[PDB]
């Protein structure tokens, strides 16, 4: 007997057919457009989307007035609206079936930083996040895969201690000023 | 020239196993 927890799960599955040209091309396009690190980052999001769409299909197998369908579908739609992948006017299970993987990729902090003009490239956005230059409200966040909620989107800015955010100049500026 | 060679390489791969090579040679005989 111990006081530890053994609860864990995997977050991705390797592809079923390992040599498909269409699959490789799709992965290349996604990684290139969103500046990802490897294939595992794509497979993780694909796993998440597969779970969501399977739940939506299973709910759609039931009758409209089934209490379980109403309760679980409302919960799922509310979560999807909160994370920002759906619209408030699209609160139906059919629109959940319409969802794609690019919709989830657009909610990462890395692409949010780039699209708001804080960075001039997607890789520059990744580097800026990893070097503790970006804050969401009070909190400094250095995880590129941080999924931005709808309300948090308007409060992404440079951190107060960052040289870009009005803080103290960095190591290189101070050394070069000392030189001259 | 390179495109022509790459097409033959696929046929070479299409029988690169030892049993595959002996397969045709009885059949051509």
């Amino acid at each position: 007997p111990v006081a530890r927890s053994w609860v864990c799960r995997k977050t991705y599955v390797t592809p079923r057919r390992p040599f498909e040209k269409s699959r490789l091309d799709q992965e290349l396009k996604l990684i290139g457009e969103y500046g990802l690190r490897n294939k595992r980052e794509v497979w993780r999001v694909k796993f998440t989307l597969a779970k969501i769409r399977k739940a939506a299909r299973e709910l759609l197998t039931l009758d409209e007035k089934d209490p379980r369908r109403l309760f679980e579908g409302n919960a799922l739609l509310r979560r999807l609206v909160r994370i920002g992948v759906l619209d408030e006017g699209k609160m139906k299970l059919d629109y959940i079936l319409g969802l794609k993987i690019e919709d989830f990729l657009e909610r990462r902090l890395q692409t949010q930083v780039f699209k708001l003009g804080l960075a001039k490239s997607i890789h520059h956005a990744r580097v800026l996040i990893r070097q503790r230059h970006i804050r969401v409200r009070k909190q400094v966040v250095n995880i590129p895969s941080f999924i931005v909620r709808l309300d948090s989107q308007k409060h992404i800015d440079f951190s107060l201690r960052s040289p870009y955010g009005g803080g103290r100049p960095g190591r290189v500026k101070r050394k070069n000023a000392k030189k001259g | 020239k390179e495109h022509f060679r790459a097409k033959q390489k696929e046929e070479e791969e299409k029988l690169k196993r030892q049993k595959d090579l002996r397969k045709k040679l009885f059949r051509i005989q």
Binding site: - | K16, R17, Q18, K19, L21
Partner: protein, 141 residues
């Protein structure tokens, strides 16, 4: 046809038992007849003594003949022929040495490989051949 009566569970259960025993995979698995069938006696690897190098003693410069050796398994005393992965790994192996042997060729035989040889040499003196070839380890005497 078979019985399709409501009260026929006992008759149906006896049929399925007989069908299981006719499966050759089921009999072999449950009686344990083929546990020791493989040349390694149920193991995945084996240890042997290097007898002599058939390929080098013949003077053919084929380089497929040259990497064939004869070893004797310690467990059962059988004499087999194995491949050395590369010419120049023969230099690391001497006669009367102790080597580790694994299987080879279930997938098939490549072009330029001698058919009928189903073993390969993996380690000598408990050191992998690739590590010796790459200069990452030294063979202890």
């Amino acid at each position: 046809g078979k019985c399709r009566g409501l009260r026929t569970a006992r008759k149906l259960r006896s049929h399925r038992r007989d069908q299981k025993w006719h499966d050759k995979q089921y009999k072999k698995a449950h009686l344990g007849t083929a546990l020791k069938a493989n040349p390694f006696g149920g193991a995945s690897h084996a240890k042997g003594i290097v007898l002599e190098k058939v390929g080098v003693e013949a003077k053919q410069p084929n380089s497929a003949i040259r990497k064939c050796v004869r070893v004797q398994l310690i467990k059962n005393g059988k004499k087999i022929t194995a491949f050395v992965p590369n010419d120049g790994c023969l230099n690391f192996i001497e006669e009367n040495d102790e080597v580790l042997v694994a299987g080879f060729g279930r997938k098939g035989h490549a072009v330029g490989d001698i058919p009928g040889v189903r073993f390969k040499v993996v380690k000598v003196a408990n050191v992998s051949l690739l590590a010796l070839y790459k200069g990452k380890k030294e063979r202890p005497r």
